[PDB]
Design a protein around this ligand. Structure first.
Ligand SMILES: C[S@@+](CC[C@H](N)C(=O)[O-])C[C@H]1O[C@@H](n2cnc3c(N)ncnc32)[C@H](O)[C@@H]1O
Ligand SMILES: C[S@@+](CC[C@H](N)C(=O)[O-])C[C@H]1O[C@@H](n2cnc3c(N)ncnc32)[C@H](O)[C@@H]1O
Ligand SMILES: C[S@@+](CC[C@H](N)C(=O)[O-])C[C@H]1O[C@@H](n2cnc3c(N)ncnc32)[C@H](O)[C@@H]1O
Ligand SMILES: C[S@@+](CC[C@H](N)C(=O)[O-])C[C@H]1O[C@@H](n2cnc3c(N)ncnc32)[C@H](O)[C@@H]1O
Ligand SMILES: [Cl-]
Ligand SMILES: [Cl-]
Lengths: 388, 389, 388, 389
């Protein structure tokens, strides 16, 4: 029987998944995806590509109704009629959105056709993760919608400029993405919440801090300068893991982001210093200048500018630590290639190989000293650079 | 070891998939999908939803370039710069597109960083299937993009009319979808190619034709099979092919432009081409089977009822209306049948219908269900046989 | 849960087994055995070796009670008390033998503690297969019981003689096994039934008869001489598969075996000719002289004698076809190595590699022309030999 | 492909076995065994039953030669002729034995036709485990070989007496097994080594000692634990090791020859050695736990009852008899607990007992079951706690 076979497959894959770590589970999940694609019929492939786009449209509707937050707090299964009446939604519309949501595990449907939270329901109720989904709907989707015609119009160029990519046609403007976003109040607020989403694991899981420090002394220097550090999660985790390391630990960002960070920052030990990383770096001779998920959002020439603003502040002991994606030369996975297409369409930037990172840093007069990977199989690493 | 466990999982699923039929493989594929969603991390969920949308956009770029057709014809792996130079694409952009494509199996990357066709490559090179991908990008995507704020602005109504749903907001018009497409020279040609993609399997694989014929005579000159809105007439062709000795007229009904397009692929005899708008009374009297495949799902109840009412006065006691369409279950419906429901709600104002909802609709037309013959699994397509009440 | 895991393993292995042929199932079964051995604890290994010997002792008890034949014909589950009363067995003894039998699948026990036939029950009810089990108990077991002390007494020799191996000590006689068996009425009868067990598949599944024949003509020669052919299954299958091939087809065996074969032989087309294969072969110039599972039961010197009795009867077109086990040089499996130990202990003989077969046939002046394997992964093959 | 499917099965089972505990692995192993029996052909069944008996005989030969101990010590693979020449075995015979051994994993054959130790090699080199294999060959095998014709000759009786079962026919004597072994200089030494094999896990892994102590005082000088027929005293050693601070005498009771043999391995203090035949009244009064591990299963009901009756008059209200033994289920019992039942029936006239049969036996001694603490799965061994009625 196929239902018996299918239940047995689920049981054994679940038992294998439970017995490995999060990296082994990510590898199993990538293999399940590749098996699905290789096994589908030609018609299934067209259907899958046609319909998987429903997921984020329906998630955005659930978010606007407050459905995922509400269902996450319910202690018992809820009927479609109870959800519809509580949330201000038409009853037949609510019933057919829940039926779609249950079919892709956005919620769970019970045997008596009621609804409970799934793991995905809990995810979409988290503010930072909800904001990532809403960001995909309102900012990424229109740009991907414009990419095919944009490339055809321009005879398939190598996109290298943030001010002439798919973004400009999608939103009918000559501004680049980041500047245009800063003039849109509702989108600014959503990105503010997006910053509260802390990625796990982080670089401190594999970064050999003591061996990189060596005999460095804080005789009143900065140990860690978090450039564009957002909520300062890197500073918070650093002070939490090495609470007796001397040296200033400084969060650098724009004033509005720094204000939103004050609530969750510790009252002691981490300075909030407003700084635009398109300007010369004010902190001189720091041990670590840290750039996490910054340079991936800029083309080569402006990513170079950012590093050139830091280099004149470095001493011989100073290091620029680039914490970012490092996809492989071969066999890159969908999370790191889909990234690449999205940031080319919206920002004109790109993901870069280890060899691509080294070539960019050499234009700044830097040399790679060490690379400390901390996620698998999609590669994120802390890359430590020195003066040439 | 982690690599060897992954490779062992792949080998065992492959072997199990090879050990069953297409319905068993579709069930396995749905199970693998369920497993993925249940095992992803919270961040993976958001990433998956953010990035899976790239597949349709990049497929449209590859279709614009003719990449899929070209690589399908290739006998040896090709480098990114060979592909770029041949198709007229920037070398950097081509390498980035191929890397993404390979990551989602839209093509395959070899150990030497060259590229081969995959099953998906082959699929996207087929014109009828290519056209469904292009239809989803240019027609379905804008409607889904407009749906959330349409529902918000309108305070989440129950959509029931084809001229007031998300489609009107998405394309800034007041026509319904089918009217509007007819006035669009840009998009009609793709819809015409879409009719050429014959779905497999079809209802004849399980339809007990001889049993359903029962006490019915083709004499003197009666119609066996009237295929209402039959498009290219696939149903008529497969019917004559499977039952070449059964007497009776076999009639393809559609609009004159579609019938003209069907002439190239119809047999020279045995199948009549009859122009007929199914919003008017059915002209063929007393046929055995009045056949409607994937017609009624595109209409709200009121218009779907009128289409059935156009047929009923032509029926004799031994006539049957055969509705060949999706029949999702009361619970546990699959993503392919719920996804379609959202899409046709947003574009057409219509809906998928359960067996009970089909019977309720047909009751208003004075019909009763005599039999239901499923022919796909686990997503249910079925030939439903209705008679006069 | 372990019961859910264990049920899922069963489901998936069963589905894989159903989807291959009998050779793939044999390979899966060998892998399950090797996995069991590698996974057991040290205590499990001693227990397994201690207790798996119960299986054939309890099978012999079930055979003597007629239990397997009786249960094979029952249309409903039977209680231990009903089986005990019907078969003339003590009720508590019957209950604990059935509990042991059910634990090793010799029968199946139901949820309400009744008993039904298993696949193994049906097997043990077949006369020829029952006789194989009874043969293992009464003839093989005592010889294996004597092998360790026999080898120690004699300082671990290379056993090469049928008249001085473990058999002589086990049954306290100086006769060789076959001669001693012929003086034991009850054992003669059991081997008579053992001959009715036809092995499947057989050599005709892969033997290219027409291409081996070539232009041979029966102008009034024998096509097939089945030497020690037993019930003549090889002759029956040959006439059934090639019913229009001209040439005599002759079953050669001892008179008592030939009598028992007459019942099941066709009335036409197969001659029954009494012949002792330790004597010169009477049929001259036949196309195929066929020896299936004969030479494995003799040491080299008497296996050579048997072939030397046939060679002077051959023409240039004649072939000796040895149908027997051909184990590999490396990675031989338990069915073909356990064989080897048993026949060395009882008969002084051995299994032989392809290279070992060629060297034996060369002493007879024969050369291997072709080898047609027909079972996997345990190798049985029809080996075709020509005059040197 | 058939090879790759086999290799994938092996990898997945290995990974599942590694992903659970020893009890999960024992369940997996029983499942693999069930699968094999259900998937074998009729001819395979007969072959398996014919040939699996070779394993014990060949293990005994390897033990006689010291093969398992030698290969266990070896740092590199060894050829058959190196092994033959070193152990004093004919080169032909050695190669044939090793080929068979490798086929059942008793050692492993390398790709270059050389031989390494396996887990089973290691096992058979351990003296206590070696001794169980030798015991099965020389003591159990002759009794099983005599059982069928013994039952036939005697018209299939219910065996209930230790001096009239298959053992008397197998060894042509009228003594019971335990008496007869004591008069056999050949076989006593192996039985002595058998006592040194400590089973794992043991009852202390789940026994809630502090809970069972309850309202009981070691003062003034009471006994915590009396291990009746305790052999080498493993139970006493592990008890003092796990509960080093719990007060009370810990007493090992056995026959003087076994106690002498236990002296080498006992701690210098904390455990008393008390000669005592458990067929006589128990001398230690008012102990908390009177412990009987794998004692009573070797006796028919009548003698097992007498052993319990020897203990009851020594008990106080807070005293408990702890029977540590096998407790097979009412249905679905495993081969390791049913196989033992046949073996001890044939040699000792005794039996395995379900929980209900244990309670019935103890009721005749005036005892009631207070608690049962299982410590192995799926084959059930349990510490059963009995109190006065
Ligand atoms: C990827 S987000 C947060 C990255 C941060 N390193 C982390 O891992 O959480 C990029 C950050 O850069 C900040 N940013 C953007 N433009 C900036 C600028 N010109 N100067 C300083 N920070 C800027 C944003 O406020 C945002 O917090
Ligand atoms: C889903 S498509 C083809 C369905 C077809 N039965 C099949 O299974 O291939 C719907 C068909 O209905 C036709 N159609 C649309 N409106 C129609 C009308 N008013 N009268 C007749 N046919 C119509 C279209 O031309 C198209 O061929
Ligand atoms: C392995 S059994 C049957 C083999 C037979 N080729 C088959 O495949 O069924 C061996 C046969 O050889 C026969 N046999 C034993 N000694 C013989 C002899 N001296 N002359 C002729 N046949 C003999 C026995 O009667 C028995 O039928
Ligand atoms: C199964 S062995 C050892 C059991 C021990 N409780 C254990 O778990 O290791 C049985 C023990 O009972 C002892 N024994 C046999 N007869 C006895 C008797 N009459 N009185 C006391 N001990 C006896 C033997 O010496 C042997 O040590
Ligand atoms: Cl026909
Ligand atoms: Cl303690």
């Amino acid at each position: 029987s196929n239902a018996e076979t299918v239940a047995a497959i689920k049981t054994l894959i679940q038992q294998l998944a439970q017995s490995t770590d999060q990296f082994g589970r990510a590898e199993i999940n990538d293999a399940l995806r590749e098996l699905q694609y290789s096994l589908e019929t030609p018609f299934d492939t067209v259907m899958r590509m046609s319909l998987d786009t429903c997921q984020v449209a329906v998630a955005r509707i659930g978010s606007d109704l407050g459905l995922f937050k509400h269902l996450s707090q319910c202690a018992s299964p809820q009927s479609a009629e109870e959800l519809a009446d509580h949330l201000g939604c038409g009853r037949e519309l609510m019933s057919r959105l829940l039926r779609y949501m249950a079919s892709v595990r956005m919620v769970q449907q019970t045997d008596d056709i009621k609804y409970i939270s799934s793991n995905i329901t809990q995810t979409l109720a988290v503010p930072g993760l909800e904001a990532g989904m809403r960001h995909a709907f309102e900012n990424l989707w229109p740009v991907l919608m414009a990419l095919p015609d944009f490339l055809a119009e321009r005879k398939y160029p190598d996109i290298v400029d943030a001010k002439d990519t798919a973004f400009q046609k999608a939103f009918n403007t000559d501004q680049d993405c980041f500047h245009w976003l800063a003039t849109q109040p509702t989108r600014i607020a959503n990105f503010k919440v997006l910053l509260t989403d802390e990625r796990t694991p982080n670089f401190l899981s594999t970064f050999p801090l003591e061996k990189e420090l060596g005999s460095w002394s804080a005789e009143e220097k900065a140990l860690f300068v978090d450039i564009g550090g957002g909520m300062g999660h890197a500073c918070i985790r650093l002070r939490e893991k090495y609470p007796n390391q001397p040296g200033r630990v400084i969060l650098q960002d724009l004033p509005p982001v720094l204000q939103a960070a004050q609530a969750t920052l510790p009252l002691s030990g981490i300075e909030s210093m407003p700084h635009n990383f398109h300007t010369p770096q004010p902190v001189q001779g720091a041990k670590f200048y840290f750039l996490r998920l910054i340079l991936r959002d800029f083309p080569d020439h402006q990513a170079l500018e950012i590093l050139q603003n830091i280099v004149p502040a470095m001493d011989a002991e100073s290091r620029i630590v680039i914490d970012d994606g490092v996809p492989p030369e071969k066999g890159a996975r969908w999370a790191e290639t889909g990234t690449d297409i999205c940031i080319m369409s919206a920002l004109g930037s790109k993901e870069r190989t280890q060899r691509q990172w080294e070539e960019l840093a050499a234009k700044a007069g830097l040399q790679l000293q060490a690379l400390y990977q901390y996620t698998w199989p999609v590669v994120n690493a802390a890359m430590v650079f020195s003066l040439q």
